[PDB]
Subunit: 291 residues, 4 copies
Amino acid sequence: MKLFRVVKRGYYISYAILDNSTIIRLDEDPIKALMRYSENKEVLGDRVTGIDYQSLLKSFQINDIRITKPIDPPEVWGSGISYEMARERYSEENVAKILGKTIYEKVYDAVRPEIFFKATPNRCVGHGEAIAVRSDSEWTLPEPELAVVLDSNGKILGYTIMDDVSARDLEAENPLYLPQSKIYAGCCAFGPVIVTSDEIKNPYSLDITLKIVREGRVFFEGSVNTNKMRRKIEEQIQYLIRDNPIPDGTILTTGTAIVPGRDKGLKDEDIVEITISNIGTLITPVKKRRK
Amino acid sequence: MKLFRVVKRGYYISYAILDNSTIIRLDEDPIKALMRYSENKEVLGDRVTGIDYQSLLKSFQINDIRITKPIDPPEVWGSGISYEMARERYSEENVAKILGKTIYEKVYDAVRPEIFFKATPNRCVGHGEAIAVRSDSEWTLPEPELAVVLDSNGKILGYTIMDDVSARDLEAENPLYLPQSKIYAGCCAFGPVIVTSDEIKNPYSLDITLKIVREGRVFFEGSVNTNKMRRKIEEQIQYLIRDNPIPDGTILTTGTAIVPGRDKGLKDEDIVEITISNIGTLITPVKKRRK
Amino acid sequence: MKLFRVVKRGYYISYAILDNSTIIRLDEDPIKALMRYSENKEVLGDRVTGIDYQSLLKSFQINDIRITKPIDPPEVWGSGISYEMARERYSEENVAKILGKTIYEKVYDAVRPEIFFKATPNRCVGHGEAIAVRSDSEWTLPEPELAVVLDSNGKILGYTIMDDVSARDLEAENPLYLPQSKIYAGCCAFGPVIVTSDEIKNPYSLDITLKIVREGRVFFEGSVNTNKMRRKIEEQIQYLIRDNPIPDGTILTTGTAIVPGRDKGLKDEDIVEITISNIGTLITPVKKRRK
Amino acid sequence: MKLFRVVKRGYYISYAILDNSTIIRLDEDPIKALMRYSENKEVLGDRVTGIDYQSLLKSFQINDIRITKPIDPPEVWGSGISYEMARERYSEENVAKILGKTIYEKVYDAVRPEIFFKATPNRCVGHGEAIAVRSDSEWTLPEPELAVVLDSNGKILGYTIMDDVSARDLEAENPLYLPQSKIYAGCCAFGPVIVTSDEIKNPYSLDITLKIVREGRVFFEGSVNTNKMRRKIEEQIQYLIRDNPIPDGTILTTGTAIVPGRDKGLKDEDIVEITISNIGTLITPVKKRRK
Ligand SMILES: [Mg+2]
Ligand SMILES: [Mg+2]
Ligand SMILES: [Mg+2]
Ligand SMILES: [Mg+2]
């Protein structure tokens, strides 16, 4: 099952695609629906015709329906430095270091992984909506990541594409600026669907692709497979929930492996496109904040 | 006006003390009430007798009413290293450093202050309720701080006492562990009242006192005045709201100046008592989390 | 306990007077409060000062509070011809008769009492508000009646004063017009309080007084005691609930004994005043409807 | 457009059939939907497949959906004696009479029509649900009637079939018993659809058919056309709303022309079937109330 959501005349409607391309309009709240499917694979609703899912993916709007965030995640959390190359996330001198070894280098090996708070729902956007670059950032990069939807016990309810938008220049100036670099209006995008757990045989065998498009131009193109992830998702979940209650429908984003260069900073009117196998392609325009 | 709130048979009731010791039961939501007073000093409600505020402060419960968090803050944010001595927040080698200078040392001077995400409302507790020490922390300290209640424009609606409970050992191991050290069930307490802006002539002239009590014993006693704060509150507010919408009733906690020693780690059954001039004394029992 | 309710800035607040003239502001819905008192005499709320009940009775408004209907009764039902003299309710020829005996004459004796539907809550008014005379009525009379508040089982939760406003001319033309004569905007008023069951030792020993005031002038004055009621209230309740569910807070009005003459028809600007022992005095201005 | 409603796992869902047999699941409340269609013929929702309307009509339930009342009418009102033959509604002596002429005879001619209060929503049932015979009734008859759905101004939003269930024996004993004879649990049924105003060219040219079925047996069969209605619907509406606000979605039932004989009283397990042209057939089992 693949869940999506549209806004229509100020109200939300949720939908699900079943393997055979048939669309079901949902009776329940989409988070409730994900919890139910997790149990017995039951889906409550009616089969609809005239909802053109493929056109929604391409055009964002048809008639008076517009695709958006597939759910409102009460909380969003991130995980850091979960790939081999991620040790080198900012290799240049000026990095913070613990006795000669950099903070990122140290955390890559350490028993305890990095976990940070990413976003509240109102700070998130979806397919076809604008992500944002801070007014005081000179170097902001999108981070293509696989993300899980969780229940309150830390059980995986589904998978989706997330963009961990990061003001990389601010983080570099001082690791104490990390929350400012990560948390703001439009700092995060996800979708276009949430896929149920059975839609992915092996989460550690999916292609993640990032393209940045500037005035028709492919400004960057990069691809890494999830078989290169060295810190497993279950361990990330484990540390996130320890002494820390998370509500149903929380999203954990599992860290990036694709890092554009210092000169590949995002700017106004850019188009970020992120693809993951079996999920789809998340497309977001870019908008620079004014002082 | 000083606002407090009680839970009574599963429902909330808000109250306000006016200068002349008279108690008013509020008609409106306490956040709405704070916004209104901010405008014209109007308070909607009825004068009550038989609500013994002084006894509530001492005993927490009388009959079937219990004092608690005076509001539900939709978000709580913290500010870091805002006092002269705070450069030395963990002076010992092993600290992360940028070209010989430590991260805390650097941020104390830098134009940009430290701002981090502290808590969601359900992660907060109030007067007479238990704060918590993480199951995997060997060194947790309370941070006595002055905190402001804000509206969505960043206007100060009032002041209160906050305890920025911190797993200091985790932060020390790696500054990337800071969110884990700061954000969890019972990581934050505030109250016992919120005082309106006019109740404090000068926020930069108040005594903050911390006492930790172990089995009747004064395990620690420390006091610093707010005239020692080097980073003003308005600048902290400025950086918090930049490209970052905050809902009405958000709390910003302004940083601590009282730092107990490495051996003064909190443990089960401890009692933390925090006093600030004109506000009152916040009292919370301590509870250690089990693995 | 005596319950009243005020509207204040578009919202309701309920209050109760206890024997010793002390005022309690209620925590619960007033219907819920009546149900609870019915059980164990428990009242949930805070004692207030500065609510001048006696002034409310006289002046209707003080500052920004106005007295109104003490509850919203989901349904209001009436009982007919429950007094000895009520056989003569319209004695003049032209009355409908069953084999020489009039319909009212017949129902006075018959095993089955008269029960009719009186009003929905939005068709009711309270102390100090305008009752209404139909645009097409040439002869409308107020009917001073004792009324009970009931729960869903038909248990008496309290007593109050009701005015069964009746377009008597329409009823006289044809008994099939009775619902039009009885049910309309402002066809019904009650209050100013609801008194709990223990506030009345004997419901069959209370003085009911009707006065109609026209431009300072006592246009009518009449008084009958409830010891003259020949059809008991419990029997009226019995027939009302038979195969007929009534929601909590339903009001049954028990029939009138005071019937002004054919020439005493109500008109614009009139003031109806109804007094019952131990309850109080219901005062309503009169307003004639325009075609 | 023809509206129906199902209950499914404790929640309601509304649907509409468009001329071409296509089913639309509604976005809005069905009363809101009727008001909108009344304006510009706009319908908000999605086309569905797998909702078998014809099977619902026949079988009441399929899988986990059950047809019921198409709306919750906040109020239901009735009109009386609107057909030529209705003068003879109980011709036998013992009838109430005004100077030799019976009450029904008088009201048939009189400028003012009969209007009475019929039911609250919780006293109503729909297609496939049980109507009821009072425990103390020895002669109850169904009254097949055309009914209008109205807005607050008295504008016709649609048409439907209603059964004005009447304890005829109680009415006959005394016209003052009419409300007891008319208003009770299960005193009223309507459906199975509401048809929009354009679905009926002439309301005064429709066949109304009543059949009562006892153990497979046609116990009664009767049919009258609406071209025999002598009191027009607009006049009934006019008198209903005069000085009398009615909420959106109120139903007025326009009076019956089919009156079974004194021996045709309903009993337990009976099946009442009512047909009107262009609307459909309302089917309700019968259940006798126990003392
Ligand atoms: Mg990331
Ligand atoms: Mg702190
Ligand atoms: Mg009366
Ligand atoms: Mg009828």
